[model samples]
Every structure is written in C-alpha cells, then in structure tokens.
Target chain A: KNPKSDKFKVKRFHHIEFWCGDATNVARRFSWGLGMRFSAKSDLSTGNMVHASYLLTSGDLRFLFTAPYSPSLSAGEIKPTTTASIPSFDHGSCRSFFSSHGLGVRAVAIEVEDAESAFSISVANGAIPSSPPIVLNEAVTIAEVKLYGDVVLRYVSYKAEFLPGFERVEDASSFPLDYGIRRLDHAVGNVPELGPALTYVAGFTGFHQFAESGLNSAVLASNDEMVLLPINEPVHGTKRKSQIQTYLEHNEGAGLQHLALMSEDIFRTLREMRKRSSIGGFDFMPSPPPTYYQNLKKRVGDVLSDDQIKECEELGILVDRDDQGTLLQIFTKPLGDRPTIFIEIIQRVGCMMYQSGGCGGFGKGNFSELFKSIEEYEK
Target chain B: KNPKSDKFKVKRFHHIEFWCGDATNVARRFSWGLGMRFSAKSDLSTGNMVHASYLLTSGDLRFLFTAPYSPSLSAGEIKPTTTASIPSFDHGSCRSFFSSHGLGVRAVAIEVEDAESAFSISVANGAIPSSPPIVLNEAVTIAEVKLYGDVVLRYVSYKAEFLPGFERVEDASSFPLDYGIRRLDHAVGNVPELGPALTYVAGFTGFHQFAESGLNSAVLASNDEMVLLPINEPVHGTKRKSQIQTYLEHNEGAGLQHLALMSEDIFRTLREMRKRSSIGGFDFMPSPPPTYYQNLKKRVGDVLSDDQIKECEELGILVDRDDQGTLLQIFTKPLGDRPTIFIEIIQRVGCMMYQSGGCGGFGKGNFSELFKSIEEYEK
Candidate 1:
C-alpha cells in the first residue's frame, strides 16, 4: 500500500454543482430522468438575488444547479461589492461559465476532514485557490481550488441538506417514482493532457492513480478510495477526433465530462429511464454491434445470466469484470446542445468486500468497445 | 374601419424560436409540461452543426428552441466561414444572445403574403432588417426585422412542418395527453417606451391599437386582427420597479416578454400544467388574493358559470371580459432563471362574431391585479 499522502484527507463527494441556464427547470429533468429528488433551493424567493440555485439528491448523491439571475450582468454591474453582497459569490465567472460550457459541472465538491486544512494544503501544494475557506454557517464550511479546465475542486467540511443560503424544498411530487440510483460512483473529467492534469490534481489532493484505460485515461482515487476521478485525454492519430478531444473542443476546454451514478440494479434503472426517454428524459447511446454482444459471454464470462446479458444488450448497458466483481454501466447522450457533459449509470454487480480496487473498476475491460461505440455514435 | 394599411398582408404566427442551452432538454420540458408534441429537430444528427434546434407544437402553436454549439467558440474559430458553413447562419449573434438572454424567444415568425415585400416594406418604413427574405427551401421563405431587445419579428411566406434542415421527430410518446391548448393568440413585448415601439411596429406591419392597460401597455393588432402584440413598458413612477421594468432589467433590455397560447378549455389545460409543475414543468403565478376571487362575479358578469369561476379560482386563471366576450388567462412564472420571459395561457370564452374589438382583448380589466400579483410574487 502507498502510505505517503497529502496533509488533508477527503471523506466523500459532497456534491457536484452545475453552472446552468435555469436551475428550476434543470432540477426537474434530473429529478425525473435520473430518479433524483428535488431537495432544496436558493433563488429570488430566498434572500439571494444574484443567482437561482437548486439542490437535487438521490440517497448519498447530491447535485447543485446554479444560474445567474441577470446573466448579462457581470460582477462589475452588481452593487458595489461587499462581504454580504451576492457579488461576492463571484458573479464574474457565473455568466461566462454557462456560456462557455453550457450546463457544465462548475464544481465537484469533496467532503474533507477540515475545510481550513483542505484550502491551505492545496494552495501550499501549488494548487490555484479559487476561493479561500469560508464557514457558511454552523453546518457548512467550504473552500475551492482550481481543478481541470474551468471546474473547481471544492472542499466541504460538512454537508446538511446542501450548503448555506439554500431553503428546503420538500419532495411534494404527486407522481410516483420507483427507480434505482444509490450514490455517485465516480466522475470523469476531460483534459487536454492526462499526465500534467494528474500531476496537478494528485499533487494537491494526494489522490493516486487507481486504474487506467480508455487508452489514455487515468483513474485517480482518494486515500480511502471514497472519491474517484477518471481523467481522460486523446490518443494521438485516432481515426478522427477522439471522444475526449471532441468533449474538450465542444466544451471549449477541459471540464467535467460525465458523472457516474451507482445503481442498485442497472437493469431496472435503465428500464425505468427508458420509459421517460420519449418524454424529454435521458436518451442512451445506441446499442453495441451484434458482434460485440455475441462475444460478451467469452469476454465477461458467466457473471451475467443469459437473460441479464440480453437485458444489457437491449438497454445498451456495457458489462465488464475483474477478479472481484463485475461492473455494468451505460451512458446517456450528451445533456446539452454541445456534445460535452452527460451522465453514466453503473452498478458493481457482485457480493464481496470492497477496497481501492477489488470490487471497484471503471469498466476498463470494456474500454475499447465503449470507445468504438461512442465513435460510431458520434459519426 | 381603417382600410388604409402599410403594404404587406400578414397571416398568423408561423412559429416562435427560442435560443436555448439545450434544445433536447428544453423541448422535453415543453412537450411534457405544456402537452406539446416534440415534433422536429436539427443538430449534428441532422446536417446543422452550429446549433441544436427543436420544433415543438400543440395544434397550431409552434415553439422552437435553439442553442449555439461550442458556445465559447465564435465564428472565427469555426472552419473558414463559407456559404455552406453553419457559421453563415449568423454565428456572430448565436453565442452572446444566449449569454445575454437565457432561454428567451429570439424570433416570433408571422406568416405573411410575401416575406420579400414584408422585409422591404418594414425596412422602407424605418424598421431595422435583421435578415433579408430568403427561400429556405421550396417550402419555406423567411425574413426578419429587429424587434425589442435581441428578439426579431420574423416574416414567413409559408410553414411546412418546420423550416428546412430539421429532421422529423415522430411522436412516439406512450404517455396520454388530454390538454386544451389550440393556437397562439397574442404575444407581449417589453420595451423601454410603449408608444415609440408601437409606432415602429405599426408603421411596418400596419397594426393598430386594439386595447391597452397594465397601466402603460398597448395592444397592437394586424389589419385583419389575426396577429396581436401587446407592447408593455412600466409607468414612470410605480410604487417600485414595475413588472415590465423588472423584465427589461433582468433580460438586459427590451425583449419578447411573453406569449399567450390559446386554449379551448383553460381550466383543464391549467390543471394539466399544474400536475407537471412539481416535476420541472411550468409553475404558474400564486393565486390572486381572496378578495379578487370573491368579487369576480361583480367584475366580469355571467360570462363564466359560477362553477367555471370556482374552477378558475382553483387553477389561478384570471378572468376578464369586454361587451362581446370573456377571456380567461394565467401566467407561468419566468421560464428561466431570470424574470425576463414567460408564457401566458389565454382562452377567449364566448360564442360570438369576431372582429377587431370584439373577443380580441389583452385582459385590460385584470391589469392592476396582475401587476399586484407579480409584485407580490417577486417580493
């Protein structure tokens, strides 16, 4: 085991925040499409006047969607900045972030042992501090350091319903919901280069490369392996622009590529999502080629029954396994006009003790096929 | 009867196009939330590469959503602009329009006898031409003149499904729909000055004032009274910022404030919309004060049955009438983060001969109450 680590320790992912055009509308789709609950929000109805914010959750997974009230008004236009003013929330980056990336994850927050240490350690290790540690209230303390592209690596000392300034939004949806998302399993970021990005992130967070694939991708994990980040870059001389490269170009630069949500049973989850797909819900990528499914038994073995394998084929779910367990996963088409950020649903299917890599994997065994499928779909 | 007109004869609304962050998701909300069908689309999947566009319709009411691709990459970054390049579709305005106005209507297309003459007559009458009349294909011809803020008054010669380059999206939704919306009845624009804006539009399209209220609002209808535009600007000295002023400020300037969709039965349409509101659909304004509902019968007479009035109160639908007919209407809160643009559902409730000043009205009697309700909601 690699014992050397950074000064601060991260517990788990607190939340992922999206720079959105409309939090109210965005939260609705995520709630119904991904089986999330509309949990909390901050908007004009609340005291905050500069931005409208929403909090969505599914079990341990939390998503924060924020959009500026007056998108054209820069931080400069807001009343003279004061500590209490909403401009202090950095109105500077709010508008352009949405324009630059189009509904992208602006911040991926990780829960740390102490927010103060998290901020200091990262900057001390040469990470660019986007924001210094700030205690929002008795319940929340947060800090941020620049991560890949325009996204931030946020450190949260604690998490209640969400951060401070947010009001509770009771789940009053009369519509019944029965789906199977458990928690956030991992987040993948697309960068121009893999090595330097890894060096930058690892230098500050003390995250180590756990597993690697997608040809040129590296999976970085926390000391406890509670948080996983797969940083992907393009491989030279592909048939065309690699999917990662396309993401970078479409997003204008490196940014959050996709988030993987862990599910209890992906078969039921995919089935449920498919029902809503025609009505403005998530749409999955095309099913793999017949040959790909034909050879699945030989590659992944009997980890899945014949019926389950057929289910995976029908739902376009990809399956792979290691010595410890099997991971079944599927991806939605890009979530916006630009083919950039989207989502992933994954389930580690097996009964076993877990660790850094035992029952954990990033579908590395299915990388080539996944890459082929994406390339074909893009064309 | 005012027989003398400007030049071109206008028909009806062809479609209204929105500049969005993601047409795919936005169309989903409109389809499910408003009971519109997801009808057509243009994207990389089709031939268009600069933007993702969607065409949604319920009966004859059409709504289009468009968002720039590589929102950060201006026209300069795209492959050397050519007649065939997507950049030729005015890449200059695509990115910033979205940045300036989040999910606002960019174009309100009116079917005209001839877009060629429509553009010429408008420009010859001092209107700023945004685009010259051009045949999109054998089936569609369109021209645009700048209207309020960044929005355009588009003149169309014909409408076939949608414009060229859009692929047909057959409605495969198994979800049942039993809503009452029928067509677009009118649109309201928020400008800095009501009279000047009306003079500008009336000078070209030959529209005349049909009704006025909301303190300083003016309703301008076409020669045949098929197209209605109620241009609204705030009074100089309201108790605080008037709703129109709020919209102008939040939108960064004057813009298409709202569009009124005609409904055959508003109570049922509103009931259906309310069900989807909690699931990321449209959210209507708070119900009018109890006294307003208590005195409803005193205001509009027996135009609506007592049971219908009770149903109106329950759905928060506003009721008003002229000598010939009654109008039932309700407004959704801002469709995006900012309180700039919104949607209005209106149903003219009377079996009578139609004319310029008969069933045609802009809920003038309900203006004060609407202003008050919006103010309270904003607060």
Candidate 2:
C-alpha cells in the first residue's frame, strides 16, 4: 500500500464556459437534445459586463454558454475602450461563427493532478495546445488550448494557497466529480491560423514540447538549459505575459475544433444518453435501417455473433475493434448552422493503446457512409 | 355603350414554392421572424432525389422552400438515388448545388387580366426575364424572369378557356405541387454560366428579351421593350404538356426562380400579418420603429405629414420616396441561412418609378442601416 502521498491528489472536472453568439437558440437545442434543464439565468444589463447565463447539467457535470450584450460598440468603424463595449474584432469572428444545427455537445473541461504534467500529456496525444498556464493568482494557474476552432480545454492547477475572487459552486482545491475528469478525451479546436497554429499555440501557452525533459524552472535555471524561466516569478505567468493573453482575449472568435468526453461506462452511458434523447431533438442513430442487416453478412466479409451485432444496433454505436480491444463512439448532428464541425464522444473498453495512436482508419471509418444515410433521412 | 369592350375580372392569391438546400432550419427561422407558419413537410427517400418542403403563409400568400440534399453520391458511392430523377442540370442555373440552400420566393402565379401587359409593367420596373411565351395550351402561357440569386419569377397567364386545369384542386395537371396551389409569387433563376443566363432563360422559356431583340428566336413576343422581362402569353387549355418541364429543360437547374402569393387585401393583409406572432415567439412590429420615423424626417427634405408616415408604418412597410412618388414595401426575413436574398410584398402608392429604386439620401440613407439592423437583430 502507498504511504501518505498528497502529490497525487487531483481536482475534479471544472465547469466549462462558452461565450455563445446566441444563447437563446443554443439553450433551446441543449435542453431538447440532452434533457438538460436550465437551472438558472443571469441578466447583466445593469453592469460593466452584461451577460445572459444558463446552467446546463447532465449527471454531475455542468456547463454554461453565455451571450453578452454591450451598447458601446467596437466591432466596426466605431471603437470603444470600456468593458461594456463589444470589441471590433468580435463582429468579424461572430459573422463567421456557424455550428451545425444538429450538433449538441461541444467541449469538455477537466482538472488534473499537476498542471504541468497535464499539459505534457495532452501534447503527447497529438493535441495542439492553445493557451499556456498563467498565474491567475498565487493559488491558480490557468492554461488553455484549441484542438479545433475556438472550442477549448483549459488546464487549471494550483500554484500556491490563494482565494478565488469570483463566486463558484466548487473550488479546484476540492475535486468533486465522480469520474474526476481523469484526462483529456479527444478535444475539438478550430484552426484559426492554419499553418502557424502550432507555433502560435506553442508561444502563447508555454506548451513545452512533449518530448522535452527538465521542463520546470529547475531545469531552466541550470546553466545546462538555454530557455530559462522562474518557477515562482510572476511576470504575467510565462506565456501569459504575451501570447496566451491574446488568445484569452477573443470576440466571436473561431469555429469549433473537436469534442472530448471521459467515460468509465462509454457503452452503458451512451445507451442512457441515447435513451434519454437524440441530439438537438433529432435521432441520428437507428439509421442503416433493418433492411441493411440482410446484406451485412456479405458486406463485411465476416460473420458476427448475434449478440454483438445486436449490441451495436441497439446502441447506435460505431465500433472500431482491433485484436486487442474495441472502442465505442458516436457524434451528434451539428450544433450551429454549418455542417463542417461538431462534437464526438468515445469510450474504450480494455485498451490504453488507442490513447496516443489516434483512429487507425479514415476519420470515423465506415461511419462516413452513415452520414449519407443521415442526409437521406433528414432530406 | 362604352363598357361592352372594357370589362375584366379580378383574381385571388395563392401559395408559392421554391427549391432550397435545408428546409427544416430555414422554415423555423422564417416562421420565427416572418409571422408565417409551416403547413406541411415531406422527406424524399428511395429515389436519387433528396428533398425537403415547407409552406409559409399570411392570409393568401404561401411561400415554400425545397432544397435537394447534397454531395451527390456517384454509383457505388455512399449516397442513395431515386428513379425518374430528372437530370439535375434543369430548372434554375445554380453553380454549387449544395451551397444554394435554395432561397427566394419562387414562381409567382398571378391573378391577372393581361399576362403580357402585367409582365411588361414589371419589366419596365426592372426585372430580368428568364423564359419567353411557350404557349402550352389554348389558354395559358408561362412567362418568367430572374431577380436575385437563383430566384425565378414566373407569371403563368391563363385565359378563360384554361379554367379546367386551373380549377383542379388536387393533382392539378399531374405536376409537382398539385393540391390547389393558389398562386406563385416569383420564379427565382440563377445560371451556372453567368453570361449565358439570359440566353438560356430566353431560349427555353420562350420569353421576349426587350434589350436585344433580333438576336434571340423568342424575341418576337412583345411585353415591353426593356432589357428585363415583365410580360406573358396565353396557353391553349388542355393543350400544354408541362410548363415546369419546358422551363426546367431550358434553364438547366439554376436556382429558386420565384414564389407566388395569393393576396386579397394587399394593404390590410400586410398590416395584419405584421401584428401576428413571429417565428421564435419574439415580439416584432410590421412597421419601422420610432427611431426609423425620426430618421425619416431628416432624409426627406420637405416636412411630411404624420398621415404619410402613419400610413407607411401601419403596413410594416419600407418607404422609398423620390421627387416622383413613394413606394411602400415589406420583406420577409431570409428563410435560409444566407442573408443574401428574401421576398417582398409591395404596394405602389403613387408611381412605380420610386419602387425598387434602391434606398435614400443623407438622413434617409440610414434606411439600409435600419434594414440591416433588423436583419442582424432577428438572426
């Protein structure tokens, strides 16, 4: 048995916030698709930062998508410099912002053991970091990244003991989620700066190359390493001093990148979620109809057990199996207006190999055919 | 003694339909913003056709948008197909079959005494012609023109002799929409090939081009001597095979050409429609706001009476006044995703000259800004 080890204590998943362009439409979709009810709403027209907030929950996880309205405009020829003003760059991004109408789930926010190690793990998994940890206070350091558009995953770890300024349901000091949001599932990030995205992410987030060792200030302060940084010195929190600051500062911004969800019971959970409701009120599963089953034996060139096949059919789950193990996954229709981007959730059974390897086949493999059927059904 | 040769009959309004890309989402937006409702829906499956339908109406005017599913799968590919699938290249001139979201108030079947003269009037007002007079039968002939993107406006003028086909409430003439299609508002047409649009429309629809007379075979027919076509011809009753077939054959599937609306109380009707509830249950007035009124004063130099403004706003109207006369019009929020096009119901109070003559001066110039505000606000 392990002796007293406080170092491994991890915080639970933190609430994720998306500044939605239109909260009314988004909230309606969320409620209908996930059986999520809006617990509360905040009206901010009376203050510096006017906002409309909605609290959404499923199981123990909660999310908030906020839409803020400001009278002082900064989006066009007019430029305003107050918190109440909607920035100029905001409109350019907002006009381009479009999510698939059917997309439901978008992003996931999870807490980790060590802020630095969590960043490393994400980078190792082919995830391009969007932001770097900045000391919000002596107590917390916040880091963020976009694997897809503006869909982001933030890593918040404590720096020293400090109190939070804003009111929160729970603090990161106390991990509360049952699953603990163990690690980043696959996340969605928009490609705003296409080629320079990697460099941009690297510079802004202090995302160290996953390959690098001697990552902390201990390694940097030594004469052996060229890039020196102080572990405690707070000059805007390393990358935060410059790059990460810019990222955290965005308006309507970019598109959705990817969706990440951690699951202990991916199969069972998916069945529950499906049984609860379809994404945005339209069922994407139950496609391929029973008629396709007649040709299934000849199509794949292999015979399958009735139980296994029935499981797949019942779950509306797409299964990717190797000799070692299998993965169960599903995607919602689309959330915004464009059909280009959305969210995906996956659960692995008996395998850690898929973690860093990525999907071996074409993105979603045979699932692309299912899209055609969906288009047919929708039409 | 003078009335024997001048007697004419009045007609009523009906529903209009257009081809679209995505119908459900478009229908929702239309209903929310325009105070219109969807009457029916159909999902196109089994055949190669991917189609969705919706109907929007206020009193007598009915509008429909039908879009074909995209990423047409080739043989052995993922997409499914249909039988009797007419060649995709007929009808309107649409470049990106998938991008269109097939918008516009298509085909306007009018209740008129003289189809040819009616078309000529629209031409004089400024509308590009699509098809010429193809006398399909003894009493009816189809005339059409292009307005904006992929929108065609066809005026099917039927003589007294053509009442049999027109009177059939169900399965009228073995065509697409047969359940007593009341009227068509506009025929929206777009050309895959830009320069050849007019030629294609003129050659196929048998429309007379007012601009270049001798160059086309169909120019012999005369509605007006203007470049835009606003004319019609009568088709012999029971003689026409398919007006749609002829139009579609010549146009090469450009885009939604037009939508027709049946109107009894054009003024009172528009006013009543505005007072009705909007699509999202949001409150909206058919008339411009107080700010719009204040701005109007500064634009139109000389002082205007309250009655003028009152009359204008009462009908949820857009007032365009020049030295000649004033035009009162109203447009629906775009039915599809794109903000590029829409439908308008107008009543020329004084002269038709000021109608559609783009909007106003100094203070009046804000008209577009106000119009744009509504667009942005609703979305």
Instruction: Return the top candidate by lDDT.
Output: 1
DockQ of every predicted complex: 0.51, 0.02
For candidate 2, the TM-score is 0.38
lDDT of each residue in A1-379, candidate 2, tens digit only: 1122222233555555554544444544444344344444443322323333555554544555554332212222333333322121132232123221112222344454566666666565555665555444456655554534445555667654111333332231111212221222444433334345544443433433221111111101111111111111112444324322222222123334334444556555555555423112323434465433333344432334566566656666565544434555666544333233344556555435444322222123344445444465555
Q: How big is the positional error of residue B24 in model 2, measured in Å on the Cα after superposition?
A: 5.8
lDDT tens readout by residue for model 1, B213-330: 4248777777767788888888766566588877877788889989899888888899999988877678888788655666787766567677877888889888887766777888
* Model 2 lDDT at residue A266: 54
Q: What share of the true interface contacts does each candidate keep?
A: 0.63, 0.00
Over 4 Å off, model 1: A1-6, A71-88, A159-161, A170-178, A212-214, A289-303, A354-360, A368-379, B1-6, B71-89, B159-161, B170-178, B211-214, B289-303, B351-360, B367-379
Q: In model 1, what lDDT does residue B211 have? A: 43
The number of clashing residue pairs in each candidate reads 0, 113
Q: How does chain B score by TM in each prediction?
A: 0.89, 0.42
Which regions of candidate 2 are displaced past 4 Å?
A1-22, A39-55, A60-89, A96-185, A190-257, A260-280, A283-309, A321-326, A345-379, B1-379
